[PDB]
Ligand binder design. Structure first.
Ligand code: HEM
Ligand code: HEM
Lengths: 145, 145
Protein backbone atom coordinates (compact mmCIF):
# COMPACT_ATOMS: atom_id res chain seq x y z
CA UNK A 1 0.00 0.00 0.00
CA UNK A 2 0.92 3.67 -0.34
CA UNK A 3 1.01 3.87 3.46
CA UNK A 4 3.65 1.16 3.65
CA UNK A 5 5.66 2.68 0.81
CA UNK A 6 5.67 6.12 2.43
CA UNK A 7 7.21 4.50 5.51
CA UNK A 8 10.25 3.41 3.48
CA UNK A 9 11.30 7.07 3.31
CA UNK A 10 13.74 6.99 6.21
CA UNK A 11 15.72 9.87 7.72
CA UNK A 12 18.64 9.51 5.31
CA UNK A 13 16.52 8.97 2.21
CA UNK A 14 14.73 12.25 2.93
CA UNK A 15 18.04 14.05 3.45
CA UNK A 16 19.43 12.78 0.15
CA UNK A 17 16.21 13.84 -1.59
CA UNK A 18 16.46 17.39 -0.22
CA UNK A 19 20.18 17.77 -0.92
CA UNK A 20 19.81 16.73 -4.56
CA UNK A 21 16.54 18.64 -5.06
CA UNK A 22 18.30 21.81 -3.89
CA UNK A 23 20.32 21.59 -7.10
CA UNK A 24 17.88 19.95 -9.52
CA UNK A 25 14.98 22.10 -8.37
CA UNK A 26 17.02 25.25 -9.05
CA UNK A 27 16.31 25.03 -12.78
CA UNK A 28 12.78 23.63 -13.10
CA UNK A 29 12.33 24.58 -16.76
CA UNK A 30 15.73 23.29 -17.82
CA UNK A 31 15.80 20.04 -15.85
CA UNK A 32 12.09 19.51 -16.44
CA UNK A 33 12.43 19.50 -20.22
CA UNK A 34 15.63 17.48 -19.91
CA UNK A 35 13.70 14.92 -17.88
CA UNK A 36 10.90 14.56 -20.45
CA UNK A 37 13.14 14.48 -23.53
CA UNK A 38 15.26 11.76 -21.92
CA UNK A 39 12.09 9.77 -21.23
CA UNK A 40 10.99 10.01 -24.86
CA UNK A 41 14.50 9.10 -26.02
CA UNK A 42 15.05 6.08 -23.75
CA UNK A 43 11.45 4.90 -23.89
CA UNK A 44 10.07 5.84 -27.30
CA UNK A 45 6.98 3.77 -26.50
CA UNK A 46 5.70 6.33 -24.00
CA UNK A 47 5.28 9.11 -26.56
CA UNK A 48 1.81 7.81 -27.44
CA UNK A 49 0.39 8.95 -24.09
CA UNK A 50 1.55 12.49 -24.87
CA UNK A 51 -0.34 13.01 -28.13
CA UNK A 52 -1.69 16.36 -26.90
CA UNK A 53 1.84 17.81 -26.63
CA UNK A 54 2.51 17.41 -30.35
CA UNK A 55 5.96 17.22 -31.91
CA UNK A 56 7.85 16.34 -28.73
CA UNK A 57 11.30 16.30 -30.37
CA UNK A 58 11.14 20.10 -30.60
CA UNK A 59 12.08 20.14 -26.94
CA UNK A 60 12.21 23.57 -25.33
CA UNK A 61 10.66 25.16 -28.44
CA UNK A 62 7.41 23.23 -27.92
CA UNK A 63 5.26 25.44 -25.68
CA UNK A 64 3.00 22.54 -24.60
CA UNK A 65 5.92 20.30 -23.72
CA UNK A 66 7.58 23.19 -21.91
CA UNK A 67 4.41 24.00 -19.99
CA UNK A 68 3.99 20.35 -19.00
CA UNK A 69 7.64 19.93 -17.99
CA UNK A 70 7.62 22.96 -15.69
CA UNK A 71 4.38 21.77 -14.11
CA UNK A 72 5.84 18.32 -13.46
CA UNK A 73 8.69 19.93 -11.51
CA UNK A 74 6.28 21.70 -9.16
CA UNK A 75 4.71 18.31 -8.44
CA UNK A 76 8.16 17.09 -7.34
CA UNK A 77 8.57 20.31 -5.36
CA UNK A 78 5.26 19.49 -3.69
CA UNK A 79 6.50 16.01 -2.73
CA UNK A 80 9.76 17.35 -1.30
CA UNK A 81 7.85 19.89 0.79
CA UNK A 82 5.58 17.20 2.28
CA UNK A 83 8.41 14.93 3.45
CA UNK A 84 8.03 16.11 7.07
CA UNK A 85 4.44 14.86 7.35
CA UNK A 86 3.66 11.42 5.85
CA UNK A 87 -0.08 12.08 6.17
CA UNK A 88 0.26 15.07 3.86
CA UNK A 89 2.72 13.32 1.56
CA UNK A 90 0.22 10.49 1.05
CA UNK A 91 -2.84 12.63 0.26
CA UNK A 92 -0.76 14.63 -2.21
CA UNK A 93 0.60 11.48 -3.86
CA UNK A 94 -2.90 10.07 -4.21
CA UNK A 95 -4.13 13.37 -5.70
CA UNK A 96 -1.60 13.23 -8.55
CA UNK A 97 -2.27 9.50 -8.94
CA UNK A 98 -5.90 10.10 -9.90
CA UNK A 99 -5.26 11.58 -13.35
CA UNK A 100 -2.55 9.04 -14.15
CA UNK A 101 -4.99 6.27 -13.21
CA UNK A 102 -7.52 7.96 -15.47
CA UNK A 103 -4.98 7.77 -18.32
CA UNK A 104 -4.35 4.09 -17.68
CA UNK A 105 -0.72 4.69 -16.71
CA UNK A 106 0.33 1.61 -14.75
CA UNK A 107 2.89 1.30 -11.95
CA UNK A 108 5.36 -0.35 -14.32
CA UNK A 109 4.79 2.44 -16.84
CA UNK A 110 5.25 5.15 -14.22
CA UNK A 111 8.47 3.47 -13.13
CA UNK A 112 9.97 4.33 -16.52
CA UNK A 113 10.79 7.77 -15.09
CA UNK A 114 13.59 6.39 -12.89
CA UNK A 115 15.97 6.15 -15.83
CA UNK A 116 15.61 9.85 -16.76
CA UNK A 117 15.88 10.89 -13.11
CA UNK A 118 19.08 8.90 -12.67
CA UNK A 119 20.51 10.60 -15.78
CA UNK A 120 19.63 14.19 -14.92
CA UNK A 121 20.99 13.39 -11.47
CA UNK A 122 24.29 12.07 -12.84
CA UNK A 123 24.63 15.18 -14.98
CA UNK A 124 24.74 17.17 -11.72
CA UNK A 125 27.27 14.88 -10.06
CA UNK A 126 24.76 12.95 -7.96
CA UNK A 127 25.39 9.20 -8.16
CA UNK A 128 23.51 5.96 -7.49
CA UNK A 129 22.93 6.84 -3.84
CA UNK A 130 20.70 9.72 -4.94
CA UNK A 131 19.13 7.87 -7.87
CA UNK A 132 18.02 5.18 -5.44
CA UNK A 133 16.59 7.72 -2.99
CA UNK A 134 14.44 9.16 -5.77
CA UNK A 135 13.43 5.66 -6.87
CA UNK A 136 11.99 5.19 -3.37
CA UNK A 137 9.97 8.40 -3.70
CA UNK A 138 8.68 7.30 -7.09
CA UNK A 139 7.74 3.97 -5.50
CA UNK A 140 5.27 5.78 -3.26
CA UNK A 141 3.37 7.00 -6.31
CA UNK A 142 3.62 3.56 -7.94
CA UNK A 143 1.89 2.08 -4.90
CA UNK A 144 -1.07 4.41 -5.50
CA UNK A 145 -1.47 3.41 -9.16
CA UNK B 1 -6.24 35.36 -25.76
CA UNK B 2 -3.83 34.74 -22.88
CA UNK B 3 -0.90 36.98 -23.87
CA UNK B 4 -3.19 40.01 -23.94
CA UNK B 5 -4.51 39.16 -20.50
CA UNK B 6 -0.92 38.73 -19.29
CA UNK B 7 -0.19 42.21 -20.63
CA UNK B 8 -2.33 43.50 -17.75
CA UNK B 9 0.21 42.17 -15.26
CA UNK B 10 2.24 45.36 -15.00
CA UNK B 11 5.37 45.88 -12.91
CA UNK B 12 3.38 47.04 -9.87
CA UNK B 13 0.75 44.30 -10.13
CA UNK B 14 3.55 41.71 -10.22
CA UNK B 15 5.20 43.36 -7.20
CA UNK B 16 1.94 43.17 -5.24
CA UNK B 17 1.49 39.52 -6.22
CA UNK B 18 4.98 38.49 -5.09
CA UNK B 19 4.71 40.39 -1.79
CA UNK B 20 1.36 38.91 -0.77
CA UNK B 21 2.40 35.41 -1.90
CA UNK B 22 5.44 35.66 0.36
CA UNK B 23 2.90 35.44 3.17
CA UNK B 24 0.03 33.48 1.65
CA UNK B 25 2.27 30.85 0.12
CA UNK B 26 4.12 30.24 3.41
CA UNK B 27 1.31 28.00 4.68
CA UNK B 28 0.04 26.21 1.59
CA UNK B 29 -1.93 23.58 3.51
CA UNK B 30 -3.65 26.08 5.80
CA UNK B 31 -4.33 28.80 3.24
CA UNK B 32 -5.15 26.34 0.48
CA UNK B 33 -7.90 24.68 2.52
CA UNK B 34 -9.15 28.10 3.64
CA UNK B 35 -9.52 29.09 -0.02
CA UNK B 36 -11.50 25.96 -0.90
CA UNK B 37 -13.75 25.98 2.16
CA UNK B 38 -14.49 29.67 1.58
CA UNK B 39 -15.37 28.93 -2.04
CA UNK B 40 -17.76 26.21 -0.87
CA UNK B 41 -19.34 28.38 1.81
CA UNK B 42 -19.80 31.41 -0.47
CA UNK B 43 -20.81 29.52 -3.62
CA UNK B 44 -22.37 26.25 -2.50
CA UNK B 45 -23.14 25.36 -6.12
CA UNK B 46 -19.43 24.84 -6.86
CA UNK B 47 -19.43 21.72 -4.70
CA UNK B 48 -21.13 20.00 -7.64
CA UNK B 49 -17.78 19.75 -9.44
CA UNK B 50 -16.05 18.21 -6.43
CA UNK B 51 -18.00 15.00 -5.83
CA UNK B 52 -14.71 13.05 -5.87
CA UNK B 53 -13.46 14.89 -2.74
CA UNK B 54 -16.30 13.39 -0.68
CA UNK B 55 -17.42 15.01 2.56
CA UNK B 56 -16.07 18.52 2.04
CA UNK B 57 -17.62 19.48 5.39
CA UNK B 58 -14.69 17.88 7.25
CA UNK B 59 -12.46 20.53 5.73
CA UNK B 60 -8.81 20.06 6.71
CA UNK B 61 -9.50 16.58 8.11
CA UNK B 62 -10.68 15.36 4.72
CA UNK B 63 -7.55 13.85 3.15
CA UNK B 64 -8.88 14.24 -0.41
CA UNK B 65 -9.71 17.93 0.08
CA UNK B 66 -6.39 18.58 1.81
CA UNK B 67 -4.55 16.88 -1.04
CA UNK B 68 -6.35 18.98 -3.65
CA UNK B 69 -5.90 22.22 -1.70
CA UNK B 70 -2.16 21.83 -1.28
CA UNK B 71 -1.76 20.95 -4.95
CA UNK B 72 -3.75 24.03 -5.98
CA UNK B 73 -1.28 26.21 -4.09
CA UNK B 74 1.63 24.85 -6.12
CA UNK B 75 -0.15 25.90 -9.30
CA UNK B 76 -0.21 29.44 -7.90
CA UNK B 77 3.44 29.07 -6.83
CA UNK B 78 4.14 28.11 -10.44
CA UNK B 79 2.35 31.23 -11.72
CA UNK B 80 4.15 33.53 -9.30
CA UNK B 81 7.51 32.09 -10.34
CA UNK B 82 6.80 32.66 -14.06
CA UNK B 83 5.62 36.28 -13.80
CA UNK B 84 8.78 37.72 -15.39
CA UNK B 85 8.67 35.61 -18.56
CA UNK B 86 5.33 36.00 -20.39
CA UNK B 87 6.13 33.06 -22.70
CA UNK B 88 6.57 30.64 -19.79
CA UNK B 89 3.65 32.06 -17.80
CA UNK B 90 1.39 31.63 -20.83
CA UNK B 91 2.34 28.02 -21.60
CA UNK B 92 1.95 27.15 -17.92
CA UNK B 93 -1.44 28.87 -17.71
CA UNK B 94 -2.66 26.99 -20.77
CA UNK B 95 -1.38 23.70 -19.35
CA UNK B 96 -3.54 24.10 -16.23
CA UNK B 97 -6.48 25.31 -18.30
CA UNK B 98 -6.78 22.03 -20.19
CA UNK B 99 -8.20 20.01 -17.31
CA UNK B 100 -10.61 22.77 -16.29
CA UNK B 101 -11.93 23.04 -19.85
CA UNK B 102 -12.33 19.26 -19.84
CA UNK B 103 -14.46 19.59 -16.69
CA UNK B 104 -16.52 22.20 -18.50
CA UNK B 105 -15.57 24.90 -16.04
CA UNK B 106 -16.28 28.27 -17.69
CA UNK B 107 -14.41 31.54 -17.19
CA UNK B 108 -17.33 32.93 -15.17
CA UNK B 109 -17.43 29.82 -13.00
CA UNK B 110 -13.65 29.95 -12.52
CA UNK B 111 -13.97 33.62 -11.56
CA UNK B 112 -15.82 32.66 -8.38
CA UNK B 113 -12.41 32.06 -6.77
CA UNK B 114 -11.88 35.83 -6.57
CA UNK B 115 -14.16 36.25 -3.57
CA UNK B 116 -12.29 33.58 -1.54
CA UNK B 117 -8.91 34.98 -2.56
CA UNK B 118 -9.96 38.42 -1.34
CA UNK B 119 -11.07 37.07 2.04
CA UNK B 120 -7.93 34.99 2.52
CA UNK B 121 -5.77 38.00 1.65
CA UNK B 122 -7.74 40.15 4.07
CA UNK B 123 -7.17 37.52 6.77
CA UNK B 124 -3.47 38.32 6.45
CA UNK B 125 -4.26 42.03 6.24
CA UNK B 126 -3.72 42.60 2.53
CA UNK B 127 -6.29 45.11 1.33
CA UNK B 128 -8.17 45.75 -1.91
CA UNK B 129 -4.94 46.76 -3.67
CA UNK B 130 -3.71 43.16 -3.43
CA UNK B 131 -7.12 41.64 -4.15
CA UNK B 132 -7.26 43.54 -7.45
CA UNK B 133 -3.77 42.35 -8.35
CA UNK B 134 -4.83 38.74 -7.83
CA UNK B 135 -8.02 39.30 -9.81
CA UNK B 136 -5.79 40.20 -12.75
CA UNK B 137 -3.76 37.00 -12.40
CA UNK B 138 -6.98 34.98 -12.32
CA UNK B 139 -8.12 36.88 -15.42
CA UNK B 140 -5.15 35.46 -17.32
CA UNK B 141 -6.40 31.91 -16.74
CA UNK B 142 -9.96 33.01 -17.53
CA UNK B 143 -8.71 34.16 -20.93
CA UNK B 144 -7.62 30.58 -21.63
CA UNK B 145 -11.01 29.14 -20.61
C1 HEM C 1 8.06 11.77 -11.31
C2 HEM C 1 7.03 11.33 -12.22
C3 HEM C 1 5.93 12.05 -12.68
C4 HEM C 1 5.26 13.09 -12.10
C5 HEM C 1 5.56 13.75 -10.75
C6 HEM C 1 4.13 13.40 -12.95
C7 HEM C 1 3.32 14.52 -12.78
C8 HEM C 1 2.32 14.91 -13.68
C9 HEM C 1 1.54 16.11 -13.55
C10 HEM C 1 1.56 17.08 -12.38
C11 HEM C 1 0.77 16.20 -14.65
C12 HEM C 1 -0.11 17.40 -14.97
C13 HEM C 1 -1.47 17.33 -14.29
C14 HEM C 1 -2.40 16.33 -14.94
O1 HEM C 1 -2.91 16.62 -16.04
O2 HEM C 1 -2.61 15.25 -14.35
C15 HEM C 1 1.02 15.03 -15.45
C16 HEM C 1 0.41 14.75 -16.68
C17 HEM C 1 0.67 13.60 -17.43
N1 HEM C 1 1.48 12.56 -17.02
FE1 HEM C 1 2.62 12.44 -15.40
N2 HEM C 1 4.04 12.52 -14.02
C18 HEM C 1 5.16 11.71 -13.88
C19 HEM C 1 5.49 10.65 -14.73
C20 HEM C 1 4.72 10.25 -15.81
C21 HEM C 1 5.03 9.11 -16.66
C22 HEM C 1 6.24 8.19 -16.51
C23 HEM C 1 4.05 9.04 -17.60
C24 HEM C 1 3.97 8.24 -18.75
C25 HEM C 1 4.38 6.87 -18.86
C26 HEM C 1 3.11 10.10 -17.28
C27 HEM C 1 2.03 10.41 -18.08
C28 HEM C 1 1.32 11.59 -18.00
C29 HEM C 1 0.43 12.05 -19.05
C30 HEM C 1 0.00 11.28 -20.31
C31 HEM C 1 0.04 13.29 -18.71
C32 HEM C 1 -0.88 14.18 -19.53
C33 HEM C 1 -0.11 15.03 -20.52
C34 HEM C 1 -1.00 16.03 -21.24
O3 HEM C 1 -1.85 15.59 -22.04
O4 HEM C 1 -0.84 17.24 -21.00
N3 HEM C 1 3.53 10.86 -16.20
N4 HEM C 1 1.97 14.21 -14.83
C1 HEM D 1 -6.95 29.97 -8.21
C2 HEM D 1 -7.64 29.17 -9.19
C3 HEM D 1 -7.50 27.79 -9.35
C4 HEM D 1 -6.34 27.10 -9.51
C5 HEM D 1 -4.92 27.66 -9.45
C6 HEM D 1 -6.70 25.72 -9.77
C7 HEM D 1 -5.78 24.68 -9.84
C8 HEM D 1 -6.12 23.34 -9.97
C9 HEM D 1 -5.17 22.24 -9.96
C10 HEM D 1 -3.66 22.36 -9.94
C11 HEM D 1 -5.89 21.09 -10.01
C12 HEM D 1 -5.29 19.69 -9.98
C13 HEM D 1 -4.81 19.25 -11.36
C14 HEM D 1 -5.96 18.92 -12.30
O1 HEM D 1 -6.58 17.86 -12.12
O2 HEM D 1 -6.22 19.73 -13.21
C15 HEM D 1 -7.28 21.47 -10.11
C16 HEM D 1 -8.33 20.57 -10.17
C17 HEM D 1 -9.67 20.93 -10.21
N1 HEM D 1 -10.15 22.23 -10.27
FE1 HEM D 1 -9.11 23.92 -10.29
N2 HEM D 1 -8.09 25.56 -9.80
C18 HEM D 1 -8.58 26.83 -9.50
C19 HEM D 1 -9.94 27.15 -9.40
C20 HEM D 1 -10.98 26.27 -9.66
C21 HEM D 1 -12.39 26.62 -9.58
C22 HEM D 1 -12.95 27.98 -9.18
C23 HEM D 1 -13.11 25.50 -9.89
C24 HEM D 1 -14.50 25.29 -9.99
C25 HEM D 1 -15.56 26.23 -9.78
C26 HEM D 1 -12.11 24.46 -10.12
C27 HEM D 1 -12.43 23.12 -10.26
C28 HEM D 1 -11.53 22.09 -10.32
C29 HEM D 1 -11.91 20.70 -10.30
C30 HEM D 1 -13.32 20.11 -10.34
C31 HEM D 1 -10.77 19.99 -10.19
C32 HEM D 1 -10.71 18.50 -9.93
C33 HEM D 1 -10.69 18.22 -8.44
C34 HEM D 1 -10.71 16.73 -8.13
O3 HEM D 1 -11.70 16.06 -8.48
O4 HEM D 1 -9.73 16.24 -7.52
N3 HEM D 1 -10.80 24.93 -10.00
N4 HEM D 1 -7.43 22.86 -10.09
Amino acid sequence: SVYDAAAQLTADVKKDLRDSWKVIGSDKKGNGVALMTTLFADNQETIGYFKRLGDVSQGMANDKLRGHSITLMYALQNFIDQLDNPDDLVCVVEKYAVNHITRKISAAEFGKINGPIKKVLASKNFGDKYANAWAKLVAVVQAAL
